[PDB]
Amino acid sequence: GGMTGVLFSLGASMVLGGVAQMLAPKARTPRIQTTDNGKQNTYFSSLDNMVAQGNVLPVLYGEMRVGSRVVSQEISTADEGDGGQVVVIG
Amino acid sequence: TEKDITIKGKTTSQYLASVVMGNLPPRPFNIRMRRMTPDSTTDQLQNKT
């Protein structure tokens, strides 16, 4: 137990994947679909309304106009009324 | 007077409209409406509300 044989140095065994990978951990590209055609969406953009069923609530960090997750949509009859008494319908 | 309403348009159908208000006063209270146009004397004017 005094000695520690089999030092087993690791050099190119970790370089073999690439050198910038051992300084920066790289990024994950999304999966490409077919019905989506060629619109390569990323993981930090959403310009359409989503559905909030058993999903997570997204967060925003700066600028970059985004869509939303619809929680309630309803149509009723538009009653006549303003912020006052002027209610002419002639 | 809480609110007014005025209608100006030729129609011979039973037309119903809706106006909303915010019930700021609490506790049971009373509500009324009053017609300002005098009742028609002849049968030519059928403006009934």
From Swiss-Prot, chain A:
Q: Does the keyword Lipid metabolism apply?
A: no
Question: GO biological process annotations for this chain's record?
Answer: viral tail assembly
The UniProt keywords, alphabetically, are:
Host cytoplasm, Late protein, Viral release from host cell, Viral tail assembly
Q: What is its main location?
A: host cell
Location of the protein in the cell: Host cytoplasm
- GO CC field: host cell cytoplasm
Q: Endoplasmic reticulum: present as a keyword of the record?
A: no
The entry sums up its family as follows: Belongs to the lambda-like tail tip protein I family.
Tell me, in a sentence or two, what this protein's role is: Plays a role in distal tail tip complex assembly. The tail tip complex is assembled successively with three tail tip proteins J, one tail tip protein I, one tail tip protein L and one tail tip protein K. The tail tip complex interacts with tail measure protein to initiate tail tube assembly. The formation of the tail tip complex is completed by the addition of tail tip protein M, which is followed by tail tube polymerization. May be excluded form tail tip during maturation and would be absent from virions.
Which protein, by its recorded name, is this? Tail tip assembly protein I
Protein's organism: Escherichia phage lambda (Bacteriophage lambda)
Q: What is the lineage of its organism?
A: Viruses, Duplodnaviria, Heunggongvirae, Uroviricota, Caudoviricetes
- Protein encoded by which gene: I
From Swiss-Prot, chain B:
Localization recorded for this chain is: Virion; Host cytoplasm
Origin superkingdom: Viruses
Cited function: Attaches the virion to the host receptor LamB, inducing viral DNA ejection. During tail assembly, initiates distal tail tip assembly by interacting with gpI, gpL and gpK. During virus entry to host cell, binds strongly to host LamB in an irreversible attachment. The binding induces structural changes in the tail leading to viral DNA injection through LamB trimeric pore.
Name the protein family: Belongs to the Caudoviricetes tip attachment protein J family.
Task: Please give the subunit comment from the record.
Answer: Interacts with host LamB.
This one is known as Tip attachment protein J
Please state the gene responsible for encoding this protein: J
